[PDB]
Write a protein that binds this ligand. Structure first.
Ligand SMILES: CC(=O)N[C@H]1[C@@H](OP(=O)(O)OP(=O)(O)OC[C@H]2O[C@@H](n3cc(-c4ccc(C=O)s4)c(=O)[nH]c3=O)[C@H](O)[C@@H]2O)O[C@H](CO)[C@H](O)[C@@H]1O
Ligand SMILES: O=Cc1ccc(-c2cn([C@@H]3O[C@H](COP(=O)(O)OP(=O)(O)O)[C@@H](O)[C@H]3O)c(=O)[nH]c2=O)s1
Ligand SMILES: [Mn+2]
Ligand SMILES: [Mn+2]
Lengths: 288, 288
């Protein structure tokens, strides 16, 4: 459940936080709307685990494995078992056009997987974009009654390190690894005013990656519904956003500020970007 | 109201947040449980004002003016008019044993004041401690119907700079100005195991000041009720905590982590502690 009130922790022994000696001095760790930006060194996972376990938190994880991308499922799921929300209840939701191709993966206690059969669109743009419609639809059918939070990610990825309850919050986006150091004018937002995803050059906080977002079920339902609706308006007007669902996600999170932002530790591509000093951990990374 | 969902902001023009060049490098701006610590330079008040105004947020502000402390009310209230939550709905609650002694203070639009007549305890220790019972009682009687958030402060104070919606959150405490740079062994927690407020030398995040705490009405009701009950247990056991209600506030916020923590900008004594470089603003300060 998502508790109505603050929970009561047991006695715990850990290092005193140091008001005058912040660990991360190299990166911004809070947004201008006072949302934490989650980097290694900003959180004590023992405190956060207690808080979330005391609420018997269930996390749903959606992933789309359409056409040849079913190949990615085995590593994705096996690494999620090692690194994603270990100790908490997890419900995996695998959307696929090939239920029989979902690999048999052994799950730890309190963890379950459901296979959702869906349509395979012809164009990769449509496969990517239609995820918003499909997640939104399933928030109603399944997720609202089954999980507390939803985490929505790309499948061509593996977990290499801890991804845990530090990410959970009503609404979150993740800094795209290609743009975390970039100026807003360089962000590849949709720039045509004819598109619902339009963001002009003097607006923008961050460029969020389409491959990792989430929040409470109700906030994810609202976001995915809104993005789908915007995409449908664009389609009726004969326009397709430059970065598809990611463009609409960015317009959405611009106007609806996320309550946490994840650092690129949570969405990385080591082949393209290496391992910069600013990344103390690489947690969720692209597979070739 | 307190909105159920994230609100939608209009287009806004402001400086881009800089992921790789944080403004505050001299202080901790997030706790290990990912609560913001509120300092000047961490927030854009225009964004926050929009978010809170779109929810028609009403803020209650409680102050006790018992016996001779009625003398502090004029300056407290006149300065609150200049600096506290300007632009938002405010409801002042003045708890006093002398209703006729409450000074006439002209209020801005959307701001009102209620005088709550209460008993004056003989011992100043009880006057201070009984605030918890009294706040809790009125949460049920008045506050739940009248305001969205409660801010509970000492009256022997004046506002000198902005105190606004950046502080609002389900539950907050404020860093006591005498200890923000101190080690937890130097915190003046209650150290006797016999007391409900007991905190041993190897525990504690911060030393919070009893003169400024708050949160949603429901969380403040729970905190004040719990602190009152703990004080009543101590009383039955023949014990009185070293710093009274503040000792119990500290025990409560140790086990129920606040969702924001305010820096000592929000609780300062300039005569006693001067004006360290780390304080860019002095917002709410002691009166001689
Ligand atoms: C690590 C990284 O930076 N990922 C980014 C990067 O992701 P990406 O290029 O690897 O996109 P993907 O190939 O993974 O497609 C997105 C997701 O959509 C699903 N998908 C995608 C596809 C295809 C996408 C492009 C194709 C080329 O013909 S096929 C597919 O055939 N079947 C399928 O199930 C799958 O879950 C996949 O992970 O670029 C996107 C925008 O398009 C985002 O910016 C994203 O954050
Ligand atoms: O003679 C010693 C006293 C200590 C507190 C007293 C008191 C406090 N109060 C309230 O408790 C708050 C805390 O007491 P304080 O400001 O004197 O405490 P400190 O700032 O010294 O910690 C005050 O701000 C008032 O709101 C009163 O209303 N009337 C009082 O007579 S009187
Ligand atoms: Mn991908
Ligand atoms: Mn005082």
């Amino acid at each position: 459940a998502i508790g109505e009130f603050m929970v009561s922790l047991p006695r715990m022994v850990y290092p005193q936080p140091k008001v005058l000696t912040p660990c991360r001095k190299d990166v911004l760790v809070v947004t201008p709307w006072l949302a934490p930006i989650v980097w290694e060194g900003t959180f004590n996972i023992d405190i956060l685990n207690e808080q979330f376990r005391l609420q018997n938190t269930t996390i749903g994880l959606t992933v789309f494995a359409i056409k040849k991308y079913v190949a990615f499922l085995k590593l994705f799921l096996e690494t999620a078992e090692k690194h994603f929300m270990v100790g908490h209840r997890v419900h995996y939701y695998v959307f696929t056009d090939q239920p029989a191709a979902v690999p048999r993966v052994t799950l730890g206690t309190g963890r379950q997987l459901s296979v959702l059969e869906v349509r395979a669109y012809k164009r990769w743009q449509d496969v990517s974009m239609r995820r918003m419609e499909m997640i939104s639809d399933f928030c109603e059918r399944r997720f609202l009654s089954e999980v507390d939070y939803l985490v929505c990610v790309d499948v061509d990825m593996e977990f290499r390190d801890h991804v845990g309850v530090e990410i959970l919050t009503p609404l979150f986006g993740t800094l795209h690894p290609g743009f975390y150091g970039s100026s807003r004018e360089a962000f590849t937002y949709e720039r045509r005013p004819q598109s619902q995803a339009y963001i002009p050059k003097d607006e923008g906080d961050f460029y969020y990656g389409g491959a990792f977002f989430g929040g409470s079920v109700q906030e994810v339902q609202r976001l995915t519904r809104a993005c789908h609706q915007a995409m449908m308006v664009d389609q009726a007007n004969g326009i397709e956003a430059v970065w598809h669902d990611e463009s609409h996600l960015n317009k959405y999170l611009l106007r609806h500020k996320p309550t946490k932002v994840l650092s690129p530790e949570y969405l990385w591509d080591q082949q393209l970007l290496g391992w910069p000093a600013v990344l103390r951990k690489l947690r969720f990374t692209a597979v070739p």
